[PDB]
Amino acid sequence: MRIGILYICTGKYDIFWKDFYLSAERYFMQDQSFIIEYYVFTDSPKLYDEENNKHIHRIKQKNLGWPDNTLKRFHIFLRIKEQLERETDYLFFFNANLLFTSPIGKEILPPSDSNGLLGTMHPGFYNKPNSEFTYERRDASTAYIPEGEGRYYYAGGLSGGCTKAYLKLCTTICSWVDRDATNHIIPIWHDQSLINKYFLDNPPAITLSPAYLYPEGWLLPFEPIILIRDKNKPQYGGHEL
Ligand SMILES: CC(=O)N[C@H]1[C@@H](OP(=O)(O)OP(=O)(O)OC[C@H]2O[C@@H](n3ccc(=O)[nH]c3=O)[C@H](O)[C@@H]2O)O[C@H](CO)[C@H](O)[C@@H]1O
């Protein structure tokens, strides 16, 4: 089947796209059943390595800067809503600085009988209890959730599921941020604080171990599968804006 993979890279984050694109081929979508379709949102005219592979689709999108670039990601997925219904069956989002290390496959695709959602544990909060989750604790916010509840702390570096179930997600949170905008609030950990609520209302069919979000340099009780490139390396410099 045809699986769609969402990817955002604006400003200088187009430096991350390449090693990701190559790694995606080596490891993602290996066995013939599956065909990969890149949906890239960039300011830039040119994306590596284009021309050559049809599937990859460059989608024009300007720079909104921090924090709007991760806050309004879901409005970015809806500019092309109708397109995602005819050309895709499953959806996924990968962080710009992600990288593949070990093969992937059908193990991450939600069963069709379930809700059809996917989340991933956060690498820093997988060994911690509810007391330490960094949700949003302001009542007037749509991302408000108090103490003693919430099962996990999901990260926004990876999320997906069936196209239907994921678009409804995209459409849901789009209102939630917009509603906050009229209430004059910006959530603390905007991509996540919003998402964690949604995964609280409707917990994903799958929760992926932080092996799929492996920070570089770290020592975890896991085998690397998908990796997080370290931004404070002198090649990247923390700062892109
Ligand atoms: C996994 C995690 O807990 N990390 C945080 C953050 O990672 P970091 O704060 O470590 O990285 P970041 O916020 O610079 O990256 C945000 C991601 O959004 C996209 N992008 C692209 C171009 C651009 O100009 N700005 C931009 O934000 C891009 O794919 C990038 O990977 O981002 C995650 C992805 O949502 C979450 O939101 C969290 O806030």
Residue bearing the CA closest to ligand 1, atom 29: 96
Residue bearing the CA closest to ligand 1, atom 28: 96
What gap in Å lies between CA 143 and CA 177, rounded to an integer? 9
Dig out the tokens for 38 from the structure.
């890149």
Atom of ligand 1 at shortest range from CA of 98:
31
Contact 231, 216 (CB under 8 A): no
**Parallel, antiparallel or unpaired: strands 158-162 and 2-8:** unpaired
Contact 181, 85 (CB under 8 A): no
Cα 16 to its chain centre, rounded Å, is 15
Backbone angles phi, psi at 240, to 5 degrees: -125, 120
Residue bearing the CA closest to ligand 1, atom 18: 70
SS (H, E, C) the chain: CEEEEEEECCCCHHHCHHHHHHHHHHHCCCCCCCEEEEEEEECCCCCCCCCCCCCCEEEECCCCCCCHHHHCHHHHCCCCCCHHHHCCCEEEEECCCEEECCCCCHHHCCCCCCCCEEEEECCCCCCCCHHHCCCECCCCCCCECCCCCCCCCECCCEEEEEHHHHHHHHHHHHHHHHHHHHCCCCCCCHHHHHHHHHHHHCCCCEEECHHHCEECCCCCCCCCCEEECCCCCCCCCCCCC
Residues contacting ligand 1 via CB (< 6 Å): 8-11, 13, 69-70, 95-97, 122, 155-157, 189, 191-192
Cα 38 to its chain centre, rounded Å, is 13
> Which residues pair with residue 35 across a beta bridge?
2
Atom of ligand 1 at shortest range from CA of 70:
27
Q: Which residues make Cβ contacts (< 8 Å) with residue 5, sequence separation at least 6?
A: 24, 28, 36, 37, 38, 39, 91, 92, 93, 94
Q: What is the dihedral of CA 164, 35, 101, 170, to 10 degrees?
A: -20
Distance 66 CA to ligand 1 centre (A): 9
Q: Which of 233, 232, 174 is nearest to 198 (CA)?
A: 174
Candidate of 70, 72, 120 to mutate for ligand 1, largest count of ligand atoms within 8 Å of Cβ: 70
**Parallel, antiparallel or unpaired: strands 226-228 and 214-215:** parallel
Atom of ligand 1 at shortest range from CA of 12:
24
Domains of the chain: residue spans and CATH: 1-241 (3.90.550.10)
Distance 33 CA to ligand 1 centre (A): 31
Dig out the tokens for 222 from the structure.
């896991």
Distance 32 CA to ligand 1 centre (A): 31
Distance 36 CA to ligand 1 centre (A): 22
Atom of ligand 1 at shortest range from CA of 10:
22
Distance 71 CA to ligand 1 centre (A): 10
What gap in Å lies between CA 156 and CA 151, rounded to an integer? 16
What gap in Å lies between CA 205 and CA 152, rounded to an integer? 13
Resolution in A: 3.4
Determination technique for this entry: X-ray
Atom of ligand 1 at shortest range from CA of 97:
31
Candidate of 95, 121, 196 to mutate for ligand 1, largest count of ligand atoms within 8 Å of Cβ: 95
Q: What is the dihedral of CA 135, 138, 143, 146, to 10 degrees?
A: 60
Q: Which residues make Cβ contacts (< 8 Å) with residue 159, sequence separation at least 6?
A: 92, 93, 118, 119, 120, 166, 169, 195
